[PDB]
Task: structure prediction
Amino acid sequence: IPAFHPGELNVYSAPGDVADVSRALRLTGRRVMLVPTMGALHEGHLALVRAAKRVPGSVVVVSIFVNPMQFGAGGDLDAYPRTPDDDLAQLRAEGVEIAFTPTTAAMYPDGLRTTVQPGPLAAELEGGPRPTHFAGVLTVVLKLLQIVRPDRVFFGEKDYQQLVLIRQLVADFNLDVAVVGVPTVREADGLAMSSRNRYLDPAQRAAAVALSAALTAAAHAATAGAQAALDAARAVLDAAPGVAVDYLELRDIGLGPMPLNGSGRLLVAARLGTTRLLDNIAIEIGTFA
Amino acid sequence: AIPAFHPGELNVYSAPGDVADVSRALRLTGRRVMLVPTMGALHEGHLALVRAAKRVPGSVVVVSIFVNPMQTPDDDLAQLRAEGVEIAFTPTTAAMYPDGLRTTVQPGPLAAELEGGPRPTHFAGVLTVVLKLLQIVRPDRVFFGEKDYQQLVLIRQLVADFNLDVAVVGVPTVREADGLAMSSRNRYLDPAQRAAAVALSAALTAAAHAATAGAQAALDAARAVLDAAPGVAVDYLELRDIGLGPMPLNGSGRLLVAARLGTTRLLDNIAIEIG
Ligand SMILES: O=C(O)c1ccc2nsnc2c1
Ligand SMILES: O=C(O)c1ccc2nsnc2c1
Result:
């Protein structure tokens, strides 16, 4: 065990260090909560930390790691926002006791060798033109769960397809961890919080409200059935200046090889300039809404 | 409430949640959980894995028996009983794959080589079920035979690459009196094939002793012995480093062979020390 100073923020970069501290904590009965992040932390992340914190006897581990394997070549990786000074200040403000900030060399000492192969859901939606993306995400989340061995792991619903694939990973590999999905945190106008919102100029920021407006409109229209819901969202997106829709799809909650029944998820992805935004919402169809 | 566990008797569990609960409860009581994965049809080679697991102080031995569709019950169970194994884990296919084949493990490029030649997806299946069994049973140590050497290397890659907290223990191949590596396939060999099959081990041990004269003398001694046998179709005979990369100029390596006798595919491998 490296030093662990309770009541303050302990930062570990070595996987063996956080693994040893985590195990020692669990053996003294603390329940270890993991919040995996890519840093550039905002209130949507602090909502995950806060949910983890309110679990009785919890110690919270927040990982910060910009995982190269979920990024495609073509500039995305070098462009991802890195603000580590701010990130650690926020965690200290929140009373988090452990930040895990591994190096690429420590995570990938053998490059890409054994990896996770997701099911067919990973080839759709965000995965369509980024066919290796979710293999990257599931591989890193598997390693983070094995290093930290948390009791529960916390993800935002904003990246809903990712949350679903993570539940698949946990079920399919019999992982002994509870996956907690936490509702999206939104700006006062409805804009889903995201580290990539910083890339919208004032006009794009004004226009971006159309995603959440479209989704909320669709959720209320849905008393009138699926067609109405989808046509309401499309009309709102169509009225928004310079919002370029990539997909808008209504699916079952598990996103899967089941037809939509009464409860669904409506998902949108759109480009504003170069910035791609995602959002989604729970939908109840007809009698159900 | 934890399922029933009776110390000193064979406790059989078919439900993954049950063996998980019992393994967790036992480890908290000061036992060290040892896992021996098998596909049943047990022979002396499997009992040597059991015996290695049993000698760890505080051990409780978990033997899984599961025919992995992706890669006699009573008799197997009696053998485990006679060895004093306290837990057998006998899941159905449905209990292991309740959502079918969905998230799986993709091995590194080693899985494309050697055995991965005729069976390109074989090792994805083995690594997937191995990862699952490790997560269900969460053993301190997991035991595999050296006879499936490439499999063992790939397991060790799985464990390192996914940061798994288990010790992988490789146990030397158990052999018949004439050196033939034990395998349930040996029983299909007719008398002429069984007599010729001894060339695999004879070639390898000849090479291991010829290796004081260097790598080419070792390979040439092994080929000469295989060349002296009738009806032995050699699929490969390769000298690699101990992690199955390229053999270095000297130092430790491993020599692997595979051959077909009739319809039966046999494999064998041995440590080699170059010069
Ligand atoms: O930073 C996040 O929003 C985030 C969201 C999902 C993640 N999966 S692994 N690391 C992740 C980080
Ligand atoms: O029965 C065996 O010889 C055997 C050998 C290796 C295995 N990896 S998973 N299940 C396995 C079973």
Notes: The beta strands of chain B are 11-13, 32-38, 59-65, 87-89, 104-106, 141-145, 167-171, 233-241, 251-261, 264-274.
